[PDB]
């Protein structure tokens, strides 16, 4: 309180503004000047009473001036409605916050004045008056409730509380004990006076009132200016014609067309052009602003957002047309000598490799059918099983299935297209809206699609056969990117004395992008390069394929510079151009050293001899599709020579090199790169050296998109970003000096020769990857709209599975990603809740979300700490013995059910060595490896062992370059692929969550426990095992209704359903319509009538033996069936004798004591109910209703002795608590058994609810 008071004191003293100069004008002098006011001198209390009454009268006049009389404003200024308030009436009584603020201010005034009146009358004392005033001015939020009508009032309320705390703890010292005896009201009184200084103008304005298409606008203004400069006579002819010309100009600008109207006058055309330019500028600004808002996270409808994207498409399309124009004007940006240099480099490399050029596919290739089948299968992957197949969509499937029908004619057609087809059709393009960046996607004609797919398969197979691509080129088919990172880290750690810096040696790890790789590939130079490794006809085909017009909606251009990047063989083209770039970067000598001699080529990261390894600074090299990762090791001399060369080319006198250095900001400061002068200069030097080797016209490496991390005697950490992983290698001998346990994100690197832990590789998730996932979830929520809850949860589960199976240990190490995951999970749950009900609930049971889909729930995979409350694992099951209650805890998380990448890799290596041993011992046995063997290695091996037993394994063995093909699939298919890195067919299945589902069901409380919160017990199905669903949000909310409409989750409720016994805790309109339909045609009243009739028939059949005179059908009011608040009598028994009745006991109370009394008449009452999850206990309900109605005044019962049978229709439960005479208890038990075996109306209700639930 002290500190908070000081805060506002300092803010007042600091935000203080000079009092503005003005002219003295006084309100009250003006009032006295007029003849309407007069002056006197009164006691303060009298004036307080007058002001109270005047405010009361003015509020009443405001209320009554609209001639309404259904709200009552009492003297203490409580505005209570007269009666239950109607929706139309709930629109006239909308006064505003100002009205209630003024009413509560008058309530405060009334409290003060009435306190003074109490003092004056002699009711209280002066000390009591002062204490009351301080209490009023301190406890104002608990006496008025003003803060609801203005939130800023919490500042004043908290300030008054702070003053209370500051004053009391000095007042209550020594003999003065703690209690209500302080009356120092001079502080709160001041606080509540400075509030009235500010709101007085506001409330007077309110009482003063109560009492006595920007682009379209700009176009309209331009047209109005034209009309102002226009003759009056021609206004119905040219005004529309001029507007039509302006619209045509806007359409042409959107399509990048040269709109021109020769008939239009030159000044008119100039004005139209100015208007078009203004509209284009406004459109560009608005599109950029909306794109930035969407990327930041602003929410908008999918249609307007799609309009914004399509606007951005046109801007990019115009920019690409312009780029093609500049290339057509500036010619080949690459120089002729640069061209011949790169061409000589590649020919030297390929003759060094003794490469055999890929020939044109002969007619009778051994595998041509196989590759065609693979291409058709890959095309079919795009077409998932769906009903949305347009003319072109179904044409593509017709064509690929025809190719399946007759492979030979298809192969002949492909070969003909290769040999002859040089001109093609326009390629359509759209864009995936990754909120970080827009990715183009290209739509190619289906015949051309098949041709390109077959060419891609054929060329990749041949290149894999001929070893065109050295091992450093990635991604490879044998290894997923997560294993790429692990092998890179191990290769770094296994270099010769890589972590030694005593002499001063420095390691440098560089990563870059090959900026604008796809765009800056000259097609003529591309053709020349392709002509060496492939037949000239095939090269001509693929190069002509990228010289093709691209269209979108209306705007189209031809592509002469860039590569289409959506073609099926674009993968091969990019991977070959990248190889040529690697020849440029490494140089022929070092490239040969890494690749190894042609007959015995090296693996990913290995050399023939360690001397070959240490023969150059460049130890490791690994190019992704366009990324490059180079690892240098320099001696002191080499590093200083490179630094000297760089500084000679780019002198740095003032040490300005420390300003533009990219760092990994996600790591702690001590774990980042330490920007010492020597290390910074070395990194800049090595980057400049690498950049110089690449001619700027072919491709560029930009510093601000690169990251060069130097490990030396100053920087003990080596950092790099590879394939979305954020890795930091820290050697054990270097700054570790600490025993380490097993941490999930940390990889224990060890030397392959001595098996000693020399380093640790800490793992993290890329900021780019986290942002991509967050944008995916944002797309899921924003593009939800009218979709079913099941579809939203399916998309969320797909996203979470992709992220958690790609970044296995990294997500565990990355705390920010854990927080983002929990936030997104809560956002998904909140959107589901809002769809369920507009009001945000409290403590929504998670059993609704996490229940498996087959079990009726949504099946949300969990990545957060959710504590299932112990009250949610309670269920009851009723049999003839009675109702039995049982109980069953943290919800399991995904990351426990996915094996870590490191364990997966070591297990894969061990299991595949085991498989090699078993395979050799078996072809020694001359048999085939069976299922019985390798069964202990079933779900093991990164190439899953299961892939050895597939049917297409021979066919899949001819599918080369499938991983890069999958990576390029995002460039052709309109669906984002979370599993762009792996293939189910080749790598198998890398994760298993069946155990997760089982532990899920166990955690929610078992099948029964899940079903308790459902309406299953209403279906009266004897078991759950034999049921099935019919593949829904209405069915979903109705299914989970008993646990959603409970009083706990929604409070301030229980509006009764009409002609129905159902309480709806909260306005749940979907549940409301379901319940209206499920209780149509007075179903509740029919239930009550039929059960009463059944009991009457049973009791007539058992009249004499129970010593009964007769049975009387007591007059039941038509609304008595749904009358909860009170009750009446349903069945009346006359004994003709005096029965001996017992103390009121439950139906199952086999042990009952006599009431020691007698009676003649016995009333039987039935109370029907719709029990929710919390209050489905029929026994408690029956006992409470029986003991309440008997002792009630509005429930008239003929005799004090009787029974009240309560039937829970929701859970098919029953219990009777009333008195029992001889034979009444077992007969009533038999009666309820028979009634729930065969009651026509109860059966009708059960069948109806089964229909509504769609559960059979």
């Amino acid at each position: 309180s002290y500190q908070k008071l000081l805060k506002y004191y300092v803010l007042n003293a600091l935000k203080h503004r000079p009092p503005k100069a003005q002219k003295k004008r006084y309100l009250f002098r003006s009032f006295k000047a007029t003849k309407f006011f007069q002056s006197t001198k009164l006691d303060w209390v009298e004036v307080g009473l007058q002001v109270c009454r005047q405010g009361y009268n003015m509020l009443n006049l405001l209320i009554h001036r609209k001639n309404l009389n259904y709200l009552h404003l009492d003297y203490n200024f409580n505005l209570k409605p007269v009666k239950t308030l109607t929706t139309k009436e709930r629109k006239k009584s909308r006064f505003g916050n100002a009205f209630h603020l003024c009413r509560e201010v008058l309530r405060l005034t009334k409290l003060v004045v009435d306190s003074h009146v109490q003092y004056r009358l002699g009711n209280v004392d002066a000390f009591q008056l002062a204490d009351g005033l301080q209490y009023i001015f301190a406890h104002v939020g608990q006496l008025t409730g003003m803060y609801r009508y203005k939130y800023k009032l919490m500042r004043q309320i908290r300030m008054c509380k702070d003053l209370k705390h500051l004053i009391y703890y000095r007042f209550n010292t020594g003999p003065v004990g703690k209690g209500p005896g302080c009356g120092f009201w001079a502080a709160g009184w001041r606080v509540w006076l400075f509030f009235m200084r500010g709101i007085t103008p506001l409330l007077e304005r309110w009482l003063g009132n109560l009492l006595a298409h920007f682009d379209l606008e700009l176009r309209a203004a331009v047209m109005h200016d034209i009309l102002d400069m226009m003759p009056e006579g021609i206004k119905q002819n040219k005004a529309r014609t001029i507007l039509q010309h302006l619209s045509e100009a806007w359409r042409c600008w959107k399509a990048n067309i040269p709109w021109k109207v020769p008939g239009l006058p030159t000044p008119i055309e100039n004005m139209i052009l100015r208007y078009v330019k203004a509209k284009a500028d406004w459109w560009t600004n608005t599109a950029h602003y909306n794109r930035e808002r969407i990327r930041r996270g602003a929410t908008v409808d999918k249609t307007v957002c799609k309009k914004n994207l399509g606007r951005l498409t046109r801007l990019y399309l115009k920019a690409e047309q312009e780029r093609q124009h500049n290339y057509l004007k500036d010619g080949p940006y690459i120089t002729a000598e640069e061209a011949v240099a790169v061409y000589t480099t590649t020919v030297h490399w390929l003759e060094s490799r003794r490469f055999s050029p890929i020939p044109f596919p002969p007619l009778s290739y051994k595998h041509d059918t196989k590759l065609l089948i693979l291409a058709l299968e890959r095309l079919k992957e795009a077409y998932s099983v769906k009903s949305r197949l347009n003319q072109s969509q179904r044409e593509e499937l017709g064509l690929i299935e025809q190719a399946y029908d007759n492979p030979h004619e298809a192969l002949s057609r492909i070969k003909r297209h290769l040999l002859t087809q040089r001109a093609f059709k326009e390629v359509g393009i759209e864009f995936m809206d990754l909120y970080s960046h827009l990715v183009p996607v290209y739509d190619v004609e289906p015949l051309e699609k098949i041709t390109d797919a077959y060419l891609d398969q054929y060329l990749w197979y041949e290149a894999d056969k001929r070893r065109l691509f050295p091992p450093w080129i990635k991604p490879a088919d044998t290894e997923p990117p997560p294993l790429l990172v692990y092998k890179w880290c191990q290769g770094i750690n296994n270099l010769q004395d890589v972590w030694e810096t005593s002499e001063g040696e420095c390691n440098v790890m560089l990563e870059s992008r090959f900026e604008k790789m796809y765009e800056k590939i000259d097609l003529t130079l591309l053709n020349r390069l392709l002509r060496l490794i492939v037949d000239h006809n095939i090269a001509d085909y693929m190069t002509a394929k990228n010289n093709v017009v691209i269209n979108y909606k209306d705007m189209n251009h031809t592509n002469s510079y860039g590569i289409i990047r959506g073609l099926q063989f674009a993968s091969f083209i990019v991977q070959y151009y990248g190889l040529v770039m690697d020849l440029l970067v490494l140089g022929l000598h070092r490239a040969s050293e890494m690749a190894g001699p042609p007959q015995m080529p090296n693996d990913f990261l290995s050399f023939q001899d360690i001397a070959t390894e240490a023969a150059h600074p460049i130890r490791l090299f690994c190019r992704y599709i366009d990324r490059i990762h180079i690892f240098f090791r320099f001696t002191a001399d080499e590093a200083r020579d490179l630094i000297q060369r760089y500084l000679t080319e780019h002198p740095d006198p003032n040490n300005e090199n420390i300003v533009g250095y990219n760092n990994k900001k996600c790591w702690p400061r001590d774990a980042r790169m330490r920007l010492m002068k020597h290390d910074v200069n070395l990194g800049r030097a090595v980057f400049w050296d690498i950049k110089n080797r690449l001619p700027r016209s072919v491709t560029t490496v930009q510093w601000e998109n690169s990251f060069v991390s130097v490990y030396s005697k100053d920087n003990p950490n080596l950092l790099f970003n590879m394939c979305g992983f954020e890795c930091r290698i820290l050697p054990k001998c270097r700054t570790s000096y600490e025993e380490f346990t097993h941490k999930d994100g940390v990889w224990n690197l060890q030397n392959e020769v001595t098996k000693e832990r020399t380093a640790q590789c800490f793992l993290r998730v890329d900021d780019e990857s986290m942002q991509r996932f967050h944008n995916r979830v944002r797309q899921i929520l924003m593009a939800s709209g009218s979709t079913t809850f099941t579809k939203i949860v399916n998309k969320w589960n797909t996203a979470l599975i992709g992220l958690m199976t790609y970044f296995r240990e990294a997500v565990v190490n990355t705390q920010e990603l854990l927080d983002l995951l929990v936030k997104c999970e809560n956002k998904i749950q909140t959107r589901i809740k809002i769809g369920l009900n507009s009001k945000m609930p409290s403590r929504f049971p998670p059993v609704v979300f996490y229940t498996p889909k087959e079990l009726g729930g949504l099946g949300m995979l969990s990545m957060g700490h959710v504590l299932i409350p112990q009250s949610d694992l309670r269920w009851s099951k009723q049999t003839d013995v009675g109702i039995t209650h049982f109980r069953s805890q943290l919800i399991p998380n995904l990351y426990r059910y996915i094996q870590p990448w490191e364990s997966e890799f070591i297990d894969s290596q061990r299991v595949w060595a085991e498989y090699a041993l078993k395979r050799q011992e078996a072809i020694a046995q001359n048999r085939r490896l069976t299922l019985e063997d390798l069964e202990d290695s079933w779900d093991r091996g990164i190439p899953r062992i299961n892939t050895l037993f597939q049917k297409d394994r021979h066919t899949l063995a001819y599918d080369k370059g499938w991983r890069v093909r999958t990576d390029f699939k995002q460039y052709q298919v309109l669906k984002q692929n979370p599993f762009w890195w792996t293939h189910q067919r080749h790598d198998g299945k890398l994760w298993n969550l069946n155990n997760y589902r089982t532990d899920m069901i166990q955690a929610l409380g078992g099948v029964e426990g899940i079903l308790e919160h459902t309406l299953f017990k209403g279906t009266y199905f004897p078991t759950w095992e034999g049921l099935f669903w019919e593949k829904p949000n209405r069915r979903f909310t109705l299914w989970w209704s008993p646990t959603i409409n409970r009083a706990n989750v929604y409070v301030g409720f229980q509006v009764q359903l009409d002609l129905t016994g159902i309480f709806m805790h909260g306005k749940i309109p979907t549940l409301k319509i379901s319940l209206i339909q499920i209780f149509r045609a007075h179903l509740w009243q029919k239930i009550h009538e039929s059960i009463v009739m059944d009991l009457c028939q049973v009791f007539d059949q058992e009249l004499d033996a129970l010593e009964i005179e007769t049975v009387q059908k007591e007059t039941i009011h038509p609304r008595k069936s749904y009358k909860m608040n009170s009750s009446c009598a349903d069945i009346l028994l006359f004994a003709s004798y005096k029965w001996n009745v017992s103390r009121p006991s439950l139906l199952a109370d086999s042990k009952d004591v006599m009431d020691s009394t007698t009676t003649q008449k016995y009333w039987i009452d039935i109370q029907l109910r719709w029990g929710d999850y919390d209050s489905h206990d029929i026994e408690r309900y029956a006992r409470a209703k029986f003991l309440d109605y008997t002792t009630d005044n509005m429930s008239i019962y003929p005799s004090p002795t009787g029974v009240l049978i309560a039937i829970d229709l929701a859970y098919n439960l029953h219990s009777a608590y009333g008195n029992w005479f001889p034979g009444s208890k077992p007969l009533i038990q038999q009666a309820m058994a028979k009634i729930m075996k065969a009651n026509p109306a109860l059966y009708v209700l059960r069948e109806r609810i089964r229909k509504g639930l769609q559960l059979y």
Partner: peptide, 27 residues
């Protein structure tokens, strides 16, 4: 005890990533 999802931060002390991960048997 609300149904809101809590962050795993600081709640992984007693669990590893690999525990409770099982392997299936051939069909």
């Amino acid at each position: 005890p609300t149904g809101e999802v809590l962050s795993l931060v600081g709640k992984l002390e007693g669990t590893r990533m690999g525990d409770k991960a099982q392997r299936t048997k051939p069909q």
